[PDB]
Amino acid sequence: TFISRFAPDQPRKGADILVEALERQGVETVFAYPGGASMEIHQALTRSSSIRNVLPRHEQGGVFAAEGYARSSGKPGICIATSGPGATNLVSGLADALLDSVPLVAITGQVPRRMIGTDAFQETPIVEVTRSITKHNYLVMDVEDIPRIIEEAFFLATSGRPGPVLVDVPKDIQQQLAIPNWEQAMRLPGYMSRMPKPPEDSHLEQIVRLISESKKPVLYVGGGCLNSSDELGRFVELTGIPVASTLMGLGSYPCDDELSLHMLGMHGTVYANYAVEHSDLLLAFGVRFDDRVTGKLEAFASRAKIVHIDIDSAEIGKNKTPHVSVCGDVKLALQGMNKVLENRAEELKLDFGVWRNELNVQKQKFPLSFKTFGEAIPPQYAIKVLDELTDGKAIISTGVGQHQMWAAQFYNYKKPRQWLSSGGLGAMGFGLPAAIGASVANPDAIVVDIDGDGSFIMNVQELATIRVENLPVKVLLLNNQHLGMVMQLEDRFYKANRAHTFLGDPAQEDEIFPNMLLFAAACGIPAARVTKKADLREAIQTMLDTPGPYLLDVICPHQEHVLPMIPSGGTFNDVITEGDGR
Amino acid sequence: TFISRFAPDQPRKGADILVEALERQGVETVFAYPGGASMEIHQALTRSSSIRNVLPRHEQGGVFAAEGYARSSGKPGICIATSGPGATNLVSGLADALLDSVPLVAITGQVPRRMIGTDAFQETPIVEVTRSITKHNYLVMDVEDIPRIIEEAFFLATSGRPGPVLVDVPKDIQQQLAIPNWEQAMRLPGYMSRMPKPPEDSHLEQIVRLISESKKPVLYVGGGCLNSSDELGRFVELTGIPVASTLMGLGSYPCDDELSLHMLGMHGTVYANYAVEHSDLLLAFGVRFDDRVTGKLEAFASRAKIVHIDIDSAEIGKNKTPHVSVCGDVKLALQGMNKVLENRAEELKLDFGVWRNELNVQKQKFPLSFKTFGEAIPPQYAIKVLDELTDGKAIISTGVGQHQMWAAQFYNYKKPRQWLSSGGLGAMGFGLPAAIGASVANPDAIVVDIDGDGSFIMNVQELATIRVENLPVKVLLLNNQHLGMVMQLEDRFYKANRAHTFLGDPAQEDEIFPNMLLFAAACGIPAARVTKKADLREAIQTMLDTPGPYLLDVICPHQEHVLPMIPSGGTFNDVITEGDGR
């Protein structure tokens, strides 16, 4: 029973209907940047006693904060912007939320309805621009459609395969007085008709049947299992199948477990890729068969029977045609298969110890390794220290690059929604704002941003947002003074010819530039810089123990390479296991 | 006779054809940020001995730098980015270059042709996204189309009404070897068929005829006259008609002249708006009748015969239907009308001294005024000092807000392409990167960024670009600690109820936050902060005299309001002339 701030017979502004529509959706936090087209919304936002607004310093930071808010909680992330340049600054976040399937709802202001199409002031057709980078978008043409469109937006953004939904609201609609109807149904007939039904018991038995007939099975877990942590953990108990996770599925199955193969793919471990290559049964639960995981599709699981489970019927048979397919919630498919495995425990043999001890041979032969040069800080080792000092219980957001892979390789995430990273779009500067939204969604959680010097500076303006909002965001900056991941491809395929990848000052090469500590100092954030490996443990411990925000400039040798590596479009027999830029 | 770096019978990479296509267009500077999809281009960029690359710290800064490069020189601005997040970061600049008609060419990398549509890694349909915010865009599907598409891109971006043109280049096309054909014609039949012919002598005489018959004529000059500085200066000699410029036409006719009415519109001077309201002939040369200039269209020049000259036939009669219309280059229309006025000098009376001395009455009755409170720095006065200390010969780029209007009101720009500001889209954070491109295009010019604390922080990362590239960019920061322009609308129409407009730290209200000096310090840039009006003249003089970059944190009282003001959709009888937030 919701309690409104207005009488049921009292006319109110359209912006008041919009804010109340958010309150009725359970929204507690929004990331709104004001402007002329959304000032009525920002005015009605102050009249709400339940919706907190985190004012960013850039709308790209606002939408990225809404992603980290969403990614670290499962709730939908809500960002608000004004028309024109405010909306165009959300584009990177919307395309990012789409490719990673993040529940997000973006509300942009717009010129009055009478002015749409005249190339007016701050007038851009944001609906036409964001049509291919959003799950769905709207353009409110009447104040009475506000409750229905907002309900459809949150339903579309959260149900099925989640994604971003944009709601363009003209200025005159925000000002028009009306009495909202909260009981009008949603106009989504063909969407709901396509919502997958619970999986049939016939499909689940044949999958369980194929498990007992298989000798070398591999679990291909991805971002679709973030809500099935317990269901997947029980499923491996009854089967004993090794688990290979994606960049997005990290945390679904604990990386520190003996059955874990960690990450597979281009930068995935050798033993995980070996398991998929030489498997006879591939259980692809909650994945989309990205090119960064398969490489040449004909070589991916070429000797394996593929079982694909998805909530998006478009992903099934999209890149790799499976044997058996199940269109539905993998959380339910695991629940059904679990009670089939325990009731048929005696019937089914289920002892793949020959197969996993074949993989454990590769696990000790080709493990995740890193060199330590003198006292220079290995970035891999620095992240391994953060794992130890936080007991693997810290929410980790990252940028995109070498530091992004090392944060995925050398951290043992125990639970899902702990690993926040742009994997689909791979957007730099995602780290710092995502940690902002994650800290707001989880106030009592250790939130650490493992960013790179190139990614960190892109949205460095959000350091002011961290201090103003008093958020205990930790910034573990892995400063390599380079556009590292691009530099690595230059060393491998372009004879180490630098093409605009150095980020420091060429007039002073051996001086670390920029001095990121002064960036934190400008925003009243305590900062420190560590260079030698001995001082690394205390420095990270100081960052964690110091209350509030903290930036740690961890200096790393730039010649490091992310290993192992499979070149774009290769097979398992093309994995690069050694080598750097020295 | 161009000199290629390759034999005419030698196959070369597609990226080498692309760079050579830029060299053949006279490109001397590009603003490129590397990525996996554009690494081949960045590799071929290093092999060029004539194209300098300014590496930004954010692609939004790269495209804004290309705008300032273009806006301050008339040459086309070229920015390059990678696929996915690199391209989505150009969106704000492309929509900005479209609404302000800035010649710009954007080159984005893309996944190989065989992968377009699979929602691949860093794969977004940038052509579909940017179709409504670009003059035109391309998707290269064969390496042999590179010379033709690049030639069509630069021709479309510069000819007619200029605008942005995007060229999406897949990765496999950059790698494909070929021998380019530089002599293939452009496939633009219906574009060139619509290119306006030189204006007929019949139209120009009737315009000159209407000038002698008119008693109260007003010149409505805009961004279309930036290339007609001399032609417009001679036209007013032969007619004596007062000149009212737009936010975009600033500098076309010197603001310090006795016939100048300065800016008209929402925040335009009272005497300029009075001239248009009580005119009988309105010469609208190079304008588009924006809502920020006309307000209620029925009241705009309601008693005036409207003569509209444009190179875009779509703008003629778009918002305000004119009497006489001329579709063509205003530079030629002025040349034709000039030689008609001097050959008919004796026939035509041409003495509007009764009308301009009627306007000079309003010029002294309601001039541009500002209060000076104690020793607090008036932002208007600070800009007036910069005009004096630079002799009005400094290239000025600004953000968007209160400081943007005061930089337009209280600076006497003597020549066009000296005033760089986002007027159409009104994009914040445009100031600092635009000054970067302007300084590269005009190395020996005084480049000053009159930015606001909200706009400056959005693209503050480009301070590293200024130091690395050793550009003498001056930053005159008008720090009001608020989202000023939005705060002003709160004081006027929302009873001064603050809705997320304060940018400092609420835990320490009287402390200036953030300390922007440490931002400059982090990037090795000398900085200073002035608070008292007496120290203002020496501080600005120190900024100018100090070689290289320099940031001046000018603190201003936030209660200041931009005056005069006409509310959105009003008439001339609705102008607000006094009032602030005190």
Ligand SMILES: Cc1cc2nc3c(=O)[nH]c(=O)nc-3n(C[C@H](O)[C@H](O)[C@H](O)COP(=O)(O)OP(=O)(O)OC[C@H]3O[C@@H](n4cnc5c(N)ncnc54)[C@H](O)[C@@H]3O)c2cc1C
């Ligand atoms: C520099 C860089 C390197 C990278 N290299 C790698 C790498 O080596 N290895 C790697 O794995 N990734 C890598 N990526 C990331 C890669 O591009 C993809 O993000 C990754 O493949 C994601 O795979 P995913 O399908 O598990 O994630 P997602 O895209 O999040 O998975 C979405 C899928 O889950 C389904 N789904 C969602 N909910 C449900 C449900 N309830 N029931 C059933 N299905 C559901 C969706 O329908 C969809 O099919 C890299 C990224 C970057 C930036």
Ligand SMILES: Cc1cc2nc3c(=O)[nH]c(=O)nc-3n(C[C@H](O)[C@H](O)[C@H](O)COP(=O)(O)OP(=O)(O)OC[C@H]3O[C@@H](n4cnc5c(N)ncnc54)[C@H](O)[C@@H]3O)c2cc1C
């Ligand atoms: C906060 C804010 C406040 C603003 N308030 C004002 C204000 O008070 N006053 C004001 O003037 N602006 C104001 N603006 C800016 C406003 O939105 C527009 O940018 C402004 O009206 C531009 O008018 P313009 O047509 O002269 O500029 P432009 O858009 O640059 O003019 C383009 C026109 O010139 C034509 N053209 C180009 N080349 C030629 C040629 N060779 N021959 C003939 N025609 C040509 C084009 O076809 C087109 O019609 C404000 C902006 C902001 C951000």
Ligand SMILES: Cc1ncc(C[n+]2csc(CCOP(=O)(O)OP(=O)(O)O)c2C)c(N)n1
């Ligand atoms: C906005 C954006 N631009 C470009 C890219 C392409 N890119 C991917 S990784 C990388 C280099 C980033 O280096 P850094 O952020 O410093 O992390 P590092 O690899 O050095 O550890 C780039 C440019 C991207 N993913 N996003």
Ligand SMILES: Cc1ncc(C[n+]2csc(CCOP(=O)(O)OP(=O)(O)O)c2C)c(N)n1
């Ligand atoms: C990216 C973007 N977001 C929002 C707006 C709307 N807007 C226009 S002016 C302004 C306030 C800017 O204040 P500031 O940059 O500090 O300049 P000031 O008015 O304070 O002098 C805003 C938010 C915009 N033009 N661009």
Ligand SMILES: [Mg+2]
């Ligand atoms: Mg780095």
Ligand SMILES: [Mg+2]
């Ligand atoms: Mg300001």
